[PDB]
């Protein structure tokens, strides 16, 4: 498969910055695609196409020259509208199905006493959907349990740490309970006190 | 806008002077690839994706050309108003539970980047440049950028940042 990018519409010390983006919004697969291209000059978005509008629109006044221009020429406007299919739908149904949407890394769950408080470190998983719950002797613990936000490692993996305030009495068994789409059955790591 | 997934395709960014540019693809906040503009080569974040899909970097090159053009025209149109520098902020954390004698990866996270030109360099107060990987600039909803710098080392370290809108370099020790 091949990735296609949108076509940046062309126009007609002190530094200056220009940025373009092609945003595709998929809900329920391709059942509802929204496509928005953005033209940003010096961190201020000034022109924008939006599928919901169906034509270019100026966002600041400097956008009127280009919007009105890009709306006037059908070879451009029809192309940008059709990019909702030639870029968004094409990329989702094609290369993303083979890469991003097929990726499944299952997490690494280890428990360790921090000093008291246990830490269930859950690392190196994809995608982002994950459930982590503490049990003490087999009964779900929801008081004294604090989790970080979802931490994005950048290399297409996530990590989350879940700390439980507890007290080690010899005999107790604490278990970390992890649910993830990559796991056929949940992971259960035990820490016997 | 709400969605199950977001594909942010064809992120072209150009700045003058200096003639620095960047072309990237993104899915759900993660970098699929950037096109190296000097070697004219699609560089995938995960080589496996580079074995499962492909992208022609020449499209990145023509899009960069277009954005350079637009940067000229709009640079003139607004009577040459310059980019406004900004204050970037860093945050350091490890990829794995840190284990002495067992290596892993350390992560420095700079944000509120604008314009996209920083020296993300490191502090054993003394420069270390080896076994470091930087990512490319990621796009924020506010059109500033963030960038990660990974440092691999002996689980024995400050992340020094040199931006324009930072009066003096800001070191974020671990």
């Amino acid at each position, epitope marked *: 498969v*091949s990735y*296609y*990018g949108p*076509k940046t519409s*062309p126009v007609q010390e002190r530094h200056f910055v220009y940025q373009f983006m092609g945003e595709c919004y998929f809900t329920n697969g391709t059942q509802r695609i929204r496509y928005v291209t953005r033209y940003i000059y010096n961190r201020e978005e000034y022109v924008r196409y939006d599928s919901d509008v169906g034509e270019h629109r100026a966002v600041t006044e400097l956008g009127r020259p280009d919007a009105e221009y890009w709306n006037s020429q059908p*070879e451009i406007l029809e*192309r940008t509208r059709a990019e909702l299919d*030639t*870029v968004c739908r*094409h990329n989702y149904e094609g290369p993303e199905t083979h890469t991003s949407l097929r990726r499944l890394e299952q997490p690494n769950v280890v428990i360790s006493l921090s000093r008291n408080t246990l830490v269930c470190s859950v690392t190196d998983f994809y995608p982002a959907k994950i459930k982590v719950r503490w049990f003490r002797n087999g009964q779900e613990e929801t008081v004294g349990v604090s989790s970080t936000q979802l931490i994005r490692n950048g290399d297409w993996t996530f990590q989350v740490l879940v700390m439980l305030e507890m007290t080690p009495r010899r005999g107790e068994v604490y278990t970390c309970h992890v649910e993830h789409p990559s796991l056929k059955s949940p992971i259960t790591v035990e820490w016997r006190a | 806008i709400e969605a199950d997934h977001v594909g942010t395709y064809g992120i072209s960014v150009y700045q003058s002077p200096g*003639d620095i540019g960047q072309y990237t693809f993104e899915f759900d906040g993660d970098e699929l690839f950037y096109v190296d503009l000097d070697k*004219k080569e699609t560089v995938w974040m995960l080589p496996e994706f580079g074995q499962l899909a492909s992208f*022609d970097p*020449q*499209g*990145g*090159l*023509q*899009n*960069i*050309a*277009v954005v*350079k*053009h637009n940067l000229g025209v709009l640079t003139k149109r607004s009577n040459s108003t310059p980019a406004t520098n900004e204050a970037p902020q860093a945050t350091v954390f490890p990829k794995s539970p840190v284990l002495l004698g067992q290596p892993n990866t350390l992560i420095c996270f700079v944000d509120n980047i604008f314009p996209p030109v920083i020296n993300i360099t490191w502090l054993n107060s003394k420069s270390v440049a080896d076994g470091v990987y930087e990512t490319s600039f990621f796009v924020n909803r506010d059109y500033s950028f963030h960038k990660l710098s990974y440092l691999t080392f002996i689980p024995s370290y400050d992340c020094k940042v040199e931006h324009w809108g930072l009066e003096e370099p800001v070191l974020k020790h671990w």
Partner: T-cell receptor, first 111, second 112 residues
Framework: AVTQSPRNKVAVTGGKVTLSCNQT?????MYWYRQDTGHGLRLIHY???????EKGDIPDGYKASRPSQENFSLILELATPSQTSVYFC???????????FGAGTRLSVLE | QVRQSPQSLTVWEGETAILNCSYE??????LPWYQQFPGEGPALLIA?????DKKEDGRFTIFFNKREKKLSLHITDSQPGDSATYFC?????????????FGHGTILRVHP
């Protein structure tokens, strides 16, 4: 208009030839082609803008130079009989449906 | 690779010349025909998009067939002024690259 220069040229092997192309369409893309019986038109080098040159399908033997938006030049440092051909320069807009060719240059490289 | 047939075609005035073209890449979505007069450089004659099964331009017509990836140019009421080399080209416009892939051309000689 897209005009080339020179339009005819005879050279000896091992000499340096410089075909040179000028365009006044305010186009951004510029291409260098050669035409030969049994091979059609073949891309040698092209360019998306000033300062950049991209390799075509048959770039060996030639270097390209785009010093400005209206000038695209093709250079043979060690001219060779196999480089005897008819060369055509083209221009095009960004995402353009049309290439605009020049009139051509006939070049012979002789032992 | 684009493949054109026949390599030479000779026609009498008023006949209908048919230049045939076939390509391999399924991703080609834009196919233009360039006309080259002797001593000149080629110029865009007529082009069709993959989404259309045709293109009418006066006496020149493009019949496109996407399933077979086959292409054909019909020149009706051929005039001796149509004697020229015709090239079939194809590009995947989605790749944003701007390289047409040219065929080898058919030399059309129209007898007066």
């Amino acid at each position: 208009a897209v005009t080339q220069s020179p339009r005819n040229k005879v050279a000896v092997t091992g000499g340096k030839v410089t075909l040179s192309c000028n365009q006044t369409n305010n186009h951004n893309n510029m291409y260098w082609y050669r035409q030969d019986t049994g091979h059609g038109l073949r891309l040698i080098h092209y360019s998306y803008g000033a300062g950049s040159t991209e390799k075509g399908d048959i770039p060996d033997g030639y270097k390209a130079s785009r010093p400005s938006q209206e000038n695209f030049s093709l250079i043979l440092e060690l001219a060779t009989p196999s480089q005897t051909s008819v060369y055509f320069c083209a221009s095009g807009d960004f995402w353009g449906d049309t290439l605009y060719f020049g009139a051509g240059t006939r070049l012979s490289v002789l032992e | 690779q684009v493949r054109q047939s026949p390599q030479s075609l000779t026609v009498w005035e008023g006949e209908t010349a048919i230049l045939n073209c076939s390509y391999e890449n399924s991703a080609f979505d834009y196919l233009p025909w360039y006309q080259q007069f002797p001593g000149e450089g080629p110029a865009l004659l007529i082009a069709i998009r993959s989404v259309s099964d045709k293109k009418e331009d006066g006496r020149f017509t493009i019949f496109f067939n996407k399933r077979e990836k086959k292409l054909s140019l019909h020149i009706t009421d051929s005039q001796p002024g149509d004697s020229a080399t015709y090239f079939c080209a194809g590009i995947d416009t989605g790749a944003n690259t701007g390289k047409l892939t040219f065929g080898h051309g058919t030399i059309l000689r129209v007898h007066p």
